[PDB]
Amino acid sequence: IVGGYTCGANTVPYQVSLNSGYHFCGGSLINSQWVVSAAHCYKSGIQVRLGEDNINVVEGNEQFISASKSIVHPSYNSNTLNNDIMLIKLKSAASLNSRVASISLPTSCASAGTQCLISGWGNTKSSGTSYPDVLKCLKAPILSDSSCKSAYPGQITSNMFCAGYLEGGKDSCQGDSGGPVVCSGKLQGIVSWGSGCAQKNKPGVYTKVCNYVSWIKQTIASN
Ligand SMILES: N=C(N)c1ccc([C@H]2[C@H]3C(=O)N(Cc4ccc5c(c4)OCO5)[C@H](C4CC4)[C@H]3[C@@H]3CCCN32)cc1
Ligand SMILES: [Ca+2]
């Protein structure tokens, strides 16, 4: 997260860290046994880390649970990042509490101008590399489809939206991939792609979760 602030320990209780001996992606807890993340975060060997603030110190409230399986959207395209969404089933159910809690899926899509909260442990500089120990937060609005398409002509599908700031300085970045975009208490986006980080006229692009609720529900019920 570039241009953001320290969230405060366990203030974003649905945020998870995907770990394979290091933090590589975020995700969101959607019930006690399932996490939503980005398909481009797929790999084998994933440990899900819940209840984290400082990802480099055991502070208390952490739960570490192996992934039992990871379900990449069958129509994910690695070229275009269309359908950049994946479900992860936990080997055992998380213990839900005030510091580890699920986030609601949306019942309708969010409109342009809606203010959202984006969170992650990704890089905090636009030029250079600086990864934080603790969780960072960014408030950002959803942009109109016309502004999104003007920023990335030909590359925006109906399964994507832009969010952020055209004047630059404030964005998600590498290491934030897969994490949540929460608007009015509901999960509306997944950190997906962008052009650099926090560059002028190049806002972040996010998977549009409202297009996948029926797929998520059908997949979880059958697995
Ligand atoms: N908020 C953001 N500014 C933002 C920037 C970059 C990313 C992601 C993602 C990203 O931008 N790309 C490159 C990319 C670039 C442009 C594209 C792409 C893919 O598909 C269609 O158009 C990667 C996908 C190919 C696997 C992925 C990469 C992984 C760590 C950081 N990158 C996340 C967030
Ligand atoms: Ca920790």
Side-chain angles (χ1 to χ4, degrees), residues 1-126 128 130-199 201-223:
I1 299 290
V2 181
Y5 58 91
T6 296
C7 303
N10 303 303
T11 52
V12 187
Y14 47 87
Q15 172 89 43
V16 319
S17 150
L18 307 185
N19 180 285
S20 57
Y22 55 103
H23 162 92
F24 66 91
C25 268
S28 304
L29 190 68
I30 56 163
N31 60 45
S32 66
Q33 220 171 349
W34 287 87
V35 169
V36 177
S37 183
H40 77 259
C41 292
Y42 175 82
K43 62 174 69 192
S44 65
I46 297 173
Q47 180 185 66
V48 180
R49 295 185 170 194
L50 302 102
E52 288 281 19
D53 186 41
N54 185 325
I55 48 172
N56 293 304
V57 172
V58 170
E59 292 184 293
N61 304 307
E62 297 93 345
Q63 299 174 51
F64 296 176
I65 303 168
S66 290
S68 68
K69 63 153 50 166
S70 300
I71 299 177
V72 165
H73 202 273
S75 297
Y76 170 58
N77 184 322
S78 57
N79 310 126
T80 64
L81 287 219
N82 196 29
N83 306 116
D84 192 11
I85 180 161
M86 155 178 86
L87 293 172
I88 297 172
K89 195 177 179 201
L90 302 186
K91 177 175 287 164
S92 59
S95 300
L96 301 179
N97 60 46
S98 55
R99 305 200 200 68
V100 179
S102 59
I103 187 67
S104 292
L105 295 171
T107 64
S108 56
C109 302
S111 59
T114 297
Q115 291 273 345
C116 305
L117 183 68
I118 313 182
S119 50
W121 290 276
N123 187 13
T124 58
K125 314 148 132 178
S126 41
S130 164
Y131 292 98
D133 288 326
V134 304
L135 184 67
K136 299 293 179 141
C137 277
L138 175 71
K139 300 228 182 41
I142 293 175
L143 306 189
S144 61
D145 262 66
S146 83
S147 293
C148 192
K149 293 171 169 180
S150 303
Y152 293 108
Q155 301 182 271
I156 302 299
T157 63
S158 61
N159 304 309
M160 306 171 184
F161 66 87
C162 292
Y165 302 88
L166 294 177
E167 68 269 36
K170 291 173 121 217
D171 196 4
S172 53
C173 199
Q174 54 213 9
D176 292 322
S177 282
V181 185
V182 170
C183 321
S184 317
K186 309 298 179 56
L187 185 65
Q188 293 285 357
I190 302 166
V191 177
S192 185
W193 59 279
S195 172
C197 310
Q199 294 315 300
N201 299 315
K202 310 165 123 192
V205 189
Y206 297 89
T207 306
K208 195 172 184 175
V209 170
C210 60
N211 288 351
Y212 300 95
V213 172
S214 69
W215 180 79
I216 293 169
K217 284 200 213 155
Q218 291 175 339
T219 302
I220 289 183
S222 51
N223 281 273

